[PDB]
């Protein structure tokens, strides 16, 4: 071991005494009790390093002796350096900053809380509900499973983090009311900050590091993402373009970590093409950042012209700023967001000369049976694609992992990969309807699987007012929970929601047909609060309500989505579809938020008529009218067989309301017991200054007719 790895692991295991106290294993306080747990674990299986890491749970009289008794030579660590690690990690704890049973309360709704369970994208959707105590037993089970995993773990932050993430994701790092920070997040953020001070070189302090700008917030953001992904000459390809962006961002993030020396704990978040890293503020580091930023832009600029740009900035910050005095942290971010906007208004200003496919096809083609990718040098056999700093070698089930680092998909367990390979997990929403050939389904196939009309379904979606949510975060650990939970909804659970899971949570949603076992759906992109999904139009129409509902539950009903839906001719080019659903999406975000653009419509331009529907409006409307006229599975009700025009007549009547809302003919115009809601003249709506029921109905009728044709 060396000083750097020790100070990483030290901040990472500082507060591992917590889960042992709560299990009632050793009878000390969490400080005492955490020391004993690691030390007991060091004796089991003889890896003495854990006894060297047990000092983090605990006038410097006994302390110097107790470290002396452990041999610093055995691990080749200076005794003075070990004290620096202990005090450094001590401070990190404070910057990222009672009944045993309290659970973790949801960062989305501090009133509701999480039932103890481990992170698992198959088993169930995390839903904040009522506050239950967690039994002492459940912590015991935790602490044993934990102990067994730590036994076989390789003692490298990259092998530690994933076992801490599994087991400690849903535990309250402090057992107070309304505490919102996941323990795993506090631990990584303490490992993150502590390593930054060490790389910083500050030492012998007990505010030089704290009241002195010895840290670096680094925010990296891509611009031109959708211009890069869509706007192509095929879904297989379009999936590889999105897959290729994820690697490029990794290639940068890792290189940043590599050249500054840091660990993945310094990665606060990395989704939606947006990353943040806490780092050291040494002149060596800003130089390495400046060197890296220019090389990435040059390679990105050479590879895709002006299509995709990487804006990168960093603000010198101090330890004061990592917390609230009188909210600084948000303010430190806001000033960095500004540097970052300004840099997007200087695209490629790191190129002085600015003012003077087959690989992806194979990658898309070989997309199904791969477990990950190896981050090797560019000149290396088997490299399938290359990012700014590195080649990427597809890692298959049978094959051997190749590279300093290995990126493995959708798992926190390394599996059989080498001991010297740095393990880097990444999650992605990669559902896809498989074709008869093992390959992903085509726009044509997907459009064939629809009920009624043969249209391709597209939806683009976004979480509303996310910036304000992430700004309200007081501290690094809070920002870490907020972002990790958010990202895991899209990257972790949208697949589940597609398969048909979470029925009892989701409930009755608008739908045209019985939900299938192998749904005709293909995720293009989903992660970091945005998503793009295509499939059979009726299955896409329904998945929109399923995703909004799951998301409503996943949060405390405290966050909302905006979605735009499109139903296109299968021959329609990809880029046009993007443009129209994009237009439809930010129309829904523009007419308020928390609303869905169900289907294109005709309306009066009197500024009193929205194209969009508030979700609960459309949902209630469907619950009302669809059962009276629609029987399900692409079949109208029997009474309306040979009465299909009646529906077409209502659409034409609505038009006369669209001609002029003020003309009362649609009253003149109106079995009569069907649709009584539209016959009367609405008086409250006239007073409220709102549209007439008649205006709204087409959203249901046009969808039913589409399914019935």
């Amino acid at each position: 071991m060396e000083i750097d790895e020790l100070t990483a692991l030290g901040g990472l295991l500082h507060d591992i005494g917590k889960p042992v106290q709560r299990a009632g294993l050793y009878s000390g306080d969490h400080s005492t009790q955490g020391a004993r747990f690691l030390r007991d674990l060091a004796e089991n299986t003889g890896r003495a390093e854990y006894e060297l890491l047990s000092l983090f749970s605990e006038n410097d009289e006994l302390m110097i002796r107790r470290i002396k008794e452990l041999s610093p030579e055995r691990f080749g660590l200076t005794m003075e350096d070990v004290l620096n690690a202990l005090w450094i990690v001590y401070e990190a704890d404070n910057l990222a900053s009672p009944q045993a049973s309290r659970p973790l309360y949801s960062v989305f709704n501090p009133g509701k809380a999480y039932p103890w369970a481990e992170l698992d994208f198959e088993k169930e959707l995390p839903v904040p509900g009522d506050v239950f105590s967690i039994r002492s037993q459940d912590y015991r089970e935790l602490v044993k499973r934990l102990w067994e995993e730590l036994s076989k773990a390789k003692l490298r932050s990259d092998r530690l983090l994933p076992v801490l993430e599994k087991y400690l994701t849903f535990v309250s790092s402090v057992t107070s009311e309304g505490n919102i920070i996941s323990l795993y997040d506090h631990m990584r953020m303490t490992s993150a900050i502590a390593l930054a001070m060490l790389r910083a070189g500050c030492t012998a302090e007990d505010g030089r590091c704290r009241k002195e700008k010895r840290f670096l917030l680094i925010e990296g953001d891509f611009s031109g993402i959708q211009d890069f992904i869509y706007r192509v000459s095929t879904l297989k390809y379009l999936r590889a373009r999105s897959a290729y962006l994820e690697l490029i961002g990794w290639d940068v993030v890792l290189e940043i970590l590599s050249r500054l020396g840091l660990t993945r704990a310094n990665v606060v978040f990395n989704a939606g093409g947006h990353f943040m890293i806490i780092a050291q503020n040494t002149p060596d580091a800003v130089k390495e950042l400046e060197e890296i930023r220019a090389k990435a832009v040059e390679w990105l600029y050479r590879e895709f012209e002006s299509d995709l740009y990487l804006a990168i900035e960093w603000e010198p910050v101090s330890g004061r700023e990592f917390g609230r005095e009188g909210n600084l942290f948000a303010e430190a971010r806001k000033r960095l967001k500004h540097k970052l906007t300004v840099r997007k208004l200087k695209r490629f200003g790191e190129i002085k000369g600015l003012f003077e496919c087959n690989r992806l096809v194979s990658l898309g083609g070989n997309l199904p049976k791969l477990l990950g990718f190896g981050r090797t040098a560019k000149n290396d056999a088997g490299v399938l694609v290359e990012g700014p700093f590195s080649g990427f070698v597809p890692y298959l089930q049978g094959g051997r992992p190749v590279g300093e680092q290995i990126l493995v998909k959708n798992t926190l367990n390394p599996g059989e990969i080498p001991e010297s390979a740095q393990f880097v997990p990444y999650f992605v929403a990669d559902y896809f309807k498989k074709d008869p050939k093992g390959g992903v389904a085509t726009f044509e196939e997907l459009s064939m699987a629809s009920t009624g009309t043969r249209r391709l379904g597209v939806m683009k979606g976004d979480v509303d007012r996310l910036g304000e949510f992430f700004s309200s975060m007081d501290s690094p650990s809070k920002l870490a929970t907020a972002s990790r939970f958010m990202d895991y909804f899209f990257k972790g659970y949208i697949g589940a929601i597609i398969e048909g899971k979470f029925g009892y949570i989701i409930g009755d949603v608008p739908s045209l047909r019985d939900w299938p076992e192998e749904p005709d759906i293909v995720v293009v992109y989903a992660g970091g609060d945005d998503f793009f999904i295509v499939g059979a139009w009726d299955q896409i129409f329904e998945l929109a309500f399923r995703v909004r509902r799951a998301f409503n539950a996943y949060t405390g009903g405290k966050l909302t989505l905006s979605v735009g839906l499109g139903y296109f001719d299968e021959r329609t080019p990809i880029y046009r579809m993007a443009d129209v659903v994009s237009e439809r999406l930010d129309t829904a975000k523009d007419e308020g938020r928390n609303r869905v653009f169900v289907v294109g419509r005709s309306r009066p331009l009197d500024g009193k008529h929205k194209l969009s529907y508030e979700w609960n409006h459309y949902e209630e409307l469907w619950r009302t009218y669809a059962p009276r006229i629609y029987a399900g599975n692409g079949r109208l009700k029997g009474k309306l067989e040979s009465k299909k025009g009646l529906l077409w007549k209502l659409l034409e009547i609505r038009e006369l309301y669209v001609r002029d809302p003020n003309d009362v003919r649609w009253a003149y115009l109106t079995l009569s017991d069907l649709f009584p809601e539209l016959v009367g003249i609405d008086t409250k709506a006239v007073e409220r200054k709102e549209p007439q029921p008649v205006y709204w109905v087409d959203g249901v009728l046009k969808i039913v007719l589409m399914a019935v044709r």
């Binding site: 906007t341 208004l345 003012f355 007012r465 304000e468």
Partner: protein
């Protein structure tokens, strides 16, 4: 400063809201058809001499629209939930009416056009056109000597009219004096610029609305001889410190 605005009254739909490189192209080719290459060379000389044309912008009725200067993007912070929504919709706006353009230059508070007078209809078969609104059209600004306007720009525009007709009136823009100016045209910069959007055509152009600091832009000749207009149409702009 006061400028000649040349209004294009369109007979039917448009396929390009043309920017300044293409307007110059069109006018260059039109000048050659009317007077021969020598005159084109005289036109290029007037332009390198100091004369400028803007890119074309929409107008509606007696409302002239101009491109939102990027100077205001970094300054929008100058309610919590009211600021978030509006900032983005203001960041999205590509045009401003003359009144609010003048404000945006001096960094004062200003508003966005509610409805803009054109719509890109893209009919499927697939290609698209621009539908103008009633008494709505596109215009561009000329600054320079009148004899050059009468001698070259006016005749050229007549000839290009024969898909539209042409009329032109004096137009004034009040603009703060400053070291910094917006471009009302798309430009091939000489120096690295302050704030910009790149434009791809192949050639890399700074977009309309970009900010420069004492940059005239330039022209380029090539062989495919044909000149490509990349000169800047500078109006003074107040910048925030940052």
């Amino acid at each position: 400063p006061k400028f000649i605005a040349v209004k294009l009254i369109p007979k039917g739909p448009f396929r390009d809201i043309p920017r300044a490189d293409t307007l110059f192209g069109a006018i260059g080719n039109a000048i050659s058809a009317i007077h021969g290459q020598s005159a084109v060379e005289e036109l290029v000389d007037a332009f390198v001499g100091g004369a400028r044309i803007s890119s074309a912008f929409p107008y509606s009725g007696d409302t002239y629209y101009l491109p939102k200067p990027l100077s205001v993007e970094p300054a929008l912070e100058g309610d919590e939930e009211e600021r978030y929504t509006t900032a983005k919709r203001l960041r999205k706006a590509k045009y401003l009416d003359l009144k609010n353009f003048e404000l945006a230059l001096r960094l004062r508070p200003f508003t966005i056009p509610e409805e803009i007078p054109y719509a890109r209809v893209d009919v499927p078969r697939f290609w698209e056109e621009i539908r103008f609104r009633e008494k709505s059209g596109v215009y561009f600004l000329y600054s320079g000597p009148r004899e050059v306007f009468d001698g070259y720009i006016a005749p050229a525009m007549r000839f290009l009219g024969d898909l539209f007709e042409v009329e032109f009136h004096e137009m004034k823009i009040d603009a703060p004096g400053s070291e910094y100016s917006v471009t009302l045209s798309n430009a091939l910069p000489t120096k690295t610029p302050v704030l910009w959007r790149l434009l791809r055509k192949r050639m890399t152009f700074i977009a309309e609305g970009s900010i420069v600091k004492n940059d005239p832009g330039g022209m380029e000749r090539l062989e495919l001889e044909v000149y490509v207009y990349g000169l800047t149409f500078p109006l003074g702009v107040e910048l925030p410190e940052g």
